[PDB]
Design a protein around this ligand. Structure first.
Ligand code: A1BEO
Ligand code: A1BEO
Ligand code: PLM
Ligand code: PLM
Ligand code: FE2
Ligand code: FE2
Lengths: 508, 504
């Protein structure tokens, strides 16, 4: 066995419109749903890929659909509702595309999209669906009703914020976004506090804690996520640049800087100060940090990388993802290559070590060379590398190991950009585990710990799987044992489920 | 699972020995394959001081030629110092006369301690200078000194010439074009029976990144159609060259990274493709081959621009284990890397990955300035654990698609294991015994083999632990590196670098 093939083309169902439900369906359980598993798997993704005869072009254009699998006493329900954003509501009103999406211009001031199709996260006692703009949407996690639109610009100085905020155990939320900060561009870290006794909305207490500089005065890098430890914030500035100068959509504004490579930045979290260490390495795209942690006076930075400066999103138009298998493979031939990489950033830079490798840790092959111009050139330790086989959408045991020394990551395996397997990676030994079934296309795995867990990987991962082959249920919730990715149960439904990006498990 | 060497036996690798007058019989354990007939010839330092005057660097000790003979399941061992100018004059004057790599004498060295290779019907021991030494492969007698400058325009040549099946020899060396690098070609022995070295010629020249500073070059790549040269940031400062030794002339260029160069072998033409990547040291190419208009370039790399030789002074290699580990903490990290070089550069693909091969994660980005930026596929990576001194089934798979490489495993620069690497699957095999320090493994095919790894590997092992024979020849099955036999001797054997198996 080598290359897994998908000639039947079932992955097309990931990109096909569905209708919302009026109320939850019961799901047919096979195997055994863990009896300790009590709560809601909430996930976001596109659900409407055209408004009548007007199509959406890009993967990130379809209208936000909020999904929920509920678990109780070994039984499972499924429910979904479109998020009532301005983009969706106005589209349903005017029966056309009203708001410009990432890769779809709307034809008839700057009406920025609030299509919150990417992720959902808690703030205080509330939950917010999001994309990557200034608009986030408050949602009801039980009914999936849309509550309110929130403009972050009303509270803090950012043009947007990522769909990947970090959330500390006390409920503090950290996020990053491009801003104006000289009349130069910069990146601001936003901090949203936990809900206090006064019970006021935490978003009204938002503040900028630290600012990162920009490599280009007028062009911020695209930032999808960032790293957080107890003491440090890590930001990776990639050569994918947003041209603020330039019937255009967002996608038309991106360009690749050929000469800058990647700049890595650290800030002291507690002292709220940028550290002027000029970390540099070769060009790559970065969407998802896996995890970050401190080891002696070094930051361990585990990344899902794409080797090259070409923007990976160029390969994610719906027309291309809907092609037949042979064409899908051909399309990916010249794309950046995915690779899981560990970078190690020294915090203590001694001039006496100019010209030498500063990474004195015993358990890594990552290096960091102090140059005479004071730049620190980084080389990674490669943890996982497969030909056009990405370990993507990484997840860990976040609550206990986020920002801390860890061993295990879980991922969605992309086969020429098509999700077709689930993966587990031991980041110390590089051992992997895989779950895969033919004609089955899974989603990001989310880890849920066993309540009496002793080890890091004592629990399950949850994934939403599309399996449209005739003589099969069209979709199901997959439960794997986190130890070995062995199948524990499925909760089958008799309707299609389109692609979802990110989500969370809300314990009850 | 760090392997430790507190007993410090590796120090015997760097201890002077005496030559033999004639071969010793070796005590065989296990079974020597009966098809194994010939001589394992290997070179290394054997004399690490001249009286009270010490040699300082690993590459300074006086060349010692070793030989294990195999016949009908029996093994002999023999060694003789090579009678170079450096050795002869040292024995005459009872001091260090010629400056060695890292030892100034208080006249370029011909201390041929590195390798031995065939030219026509002859065998030459070599270092990396213009002087190579003809030797008798049966008696180990020194025959004569040859100056390559008498024949071709090069200042020196590597100890890693490529040798085609017909006997054609290719090598590279720095020269004067500006500085440049010349490929030397020595033809096979013809019917006229004249010395092939007298028919030497420069076939192609590579340009230099710096007008006055050539990169150090230890080896290069060769396929049926192409020559691959890797120009590293380790530079030789000819100004500071012309009480200094060779080591004092090296410096690291911080900004250039690595430049890769290809030349058309048959059309004898340099190809102006500006391949670029991040900085590393390179000593040993593993293998090179052509795959559908791409060159696959497998390298043993060291991550960084600091010269790895800085860590190879004898004083440092002789320290106790805890000190040896501490010394290597800030050294470049070893890594086996596969680079893929596109031969077809289309402007229409500017900004994109040109490596469309299905079986690699290596990339090559065409930039607007026309440089091609390379990223490798990593084949092997261990913390301060080098897969080094690589060997393949060279006669049948050299320059061609291949699967298997064999290597010496370096533990903080100390050789302590033998390794096999599947370069397609990245599966490895290991042979290792405590207090045993092996040498470069050399692959010998079963003469009727159709498979790539159907044979044995030979390694010379030092094992000085009390209640043991001090050294032995190890024979492993090439399939799984399982032990087949040993040929034990009752004398020490110092470190050897490279060599060959001469079939008889
Ligand atoms: C040009 C400004 C950028 C960044 C501030 C922006 O807003 O980019 C998006 C605009 C709309 C949607 C999206 C999707 O969420 C991307 C997929 N995760 C990104
Ligand atoms: C500075 C000029 C260079 C030529 C590139 C040179 O001559 O370097 C050496 C001089 C003497 C000995 C050696 C050893 O063989 C190195 C270890 N294999 C190298
Ligand atoms: C589950 C998605 C399958 C379709 C193809 C996915 C390709 C993803 C490429 C790398 C990750 C880029 C970020 C997308 C997810 C997000 O919006 O957070
Ligand atoms: C077997 C030698 C052990 C001692 C330390 C060896 C470290 C070698 C570093 C990489 C290879 C450098 C070139 C040395 C061999 C040669 O001269 O051809
Ligand atoms: Fe994401
Ligand atoms: Fe060598």
């Amino acid at each position: 066995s080598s290359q897994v093939e998908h000639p039947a083309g079932g992955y097309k169902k990931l990109f096909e419109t569905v209708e919302e439900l009026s109320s939850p369906l019961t799901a047919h359980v096979t195997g055994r749903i863990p009896l300790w598993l009590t709560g809601s798997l909430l996930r976001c993704g596109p659900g409407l890929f055209e408004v009548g005869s007007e199509p959406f072009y890009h993967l990130f254009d379809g209208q936000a659909l909020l999904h929920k699998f509920d678990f109780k006493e070994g039984h499972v329900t499924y429910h979904r509702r479109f998020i009532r954003t301005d983009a969706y509501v106005r589209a349903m009103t005017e029966k056309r595309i009203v708001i410009t999406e990432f890769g779809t211009c709307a034809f008839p001031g700057v009406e920025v999209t609030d299509n919150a199709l990417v992720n959902i996260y808690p703030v205080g006692e509330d939950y917010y669906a999001c994309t990557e703009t200034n608009f986030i949407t408050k949602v009801n996690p039980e009914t999936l009703e849309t509550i309110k639109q929130v403009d972050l610009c009303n509270y803090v100085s950012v043009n947007g914020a990522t769909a990947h905020p970090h959330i500390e155990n006390d409920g503090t939320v950290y996020n990053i976004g491009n801003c104006f900060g000289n009349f130069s561009i910069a990146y601001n870290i936003v901090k949203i506090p936990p809900l206090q006794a006064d019970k006021e909305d935490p978003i009204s207490k938002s503040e900028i804690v630290v600012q990162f500089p920009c490599s280009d005065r007028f062009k911020p890098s695209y930032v999808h996520s960032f790293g957080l430890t107890p003491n440090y914030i890590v930001f990776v500035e990639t050569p994918v640049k947003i041209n603020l100068f330039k019937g255009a959509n967002y996608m038309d504004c991106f360009e690749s800087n050929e000469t800058m490579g990647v700049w890595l930045h650290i800030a002291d979290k507690k002292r709220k100060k940028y550290i002027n260490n000029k970390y540099r390495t070769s060009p790559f795209n970065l969407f998802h940090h896996i995890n970050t942690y401190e080891d002696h006076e070094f930051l361990i930075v585990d990344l899902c990388c794409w080797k090259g400066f070409e923007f990976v999103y160029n390969y994610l138009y719906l027309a291309n993802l809907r092609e037949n298998w042979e064409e899908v493979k051909k399309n990916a031939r010249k794309a950046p290559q995915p690779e899981v990489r560990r970078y190690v950033l020294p915090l203590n830079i001694d001039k006496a070590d100019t010209g030498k490798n500063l990474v004195t840790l015993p358990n890594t092959t990552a290096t960091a060379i102090l140059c005479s111009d004071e730049t620190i050139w980084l080389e990674p330790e490669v943890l996982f590398s497969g030909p056009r086989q990405a370990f993507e959408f990484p997840q860990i045991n976040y609550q206990k190991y986020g920002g801390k020394p860890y061993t295990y990551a879980y991922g969605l395996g992309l086969n020429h950009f098509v999700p077709d397997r689930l993966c587990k990676l031991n980041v110390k030994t590089k051992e992997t585990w895989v779950w895969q079934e033919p004609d089955s296309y899974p989603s990001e795995p989310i880890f849920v710990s066993h309540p009496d867990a002793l080890e890091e990987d004592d629990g399950v991962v949850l994934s939403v799987v599309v399996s449209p082959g005739a003589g099969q249920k069209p979709a199901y919730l997959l439960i794997l044992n986190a130890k070995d990715l062995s199948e524990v149960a499925r909760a089958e439904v008799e309707i299609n489920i389109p692609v979802t990006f990110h989500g969370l498990f809300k314990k009850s």
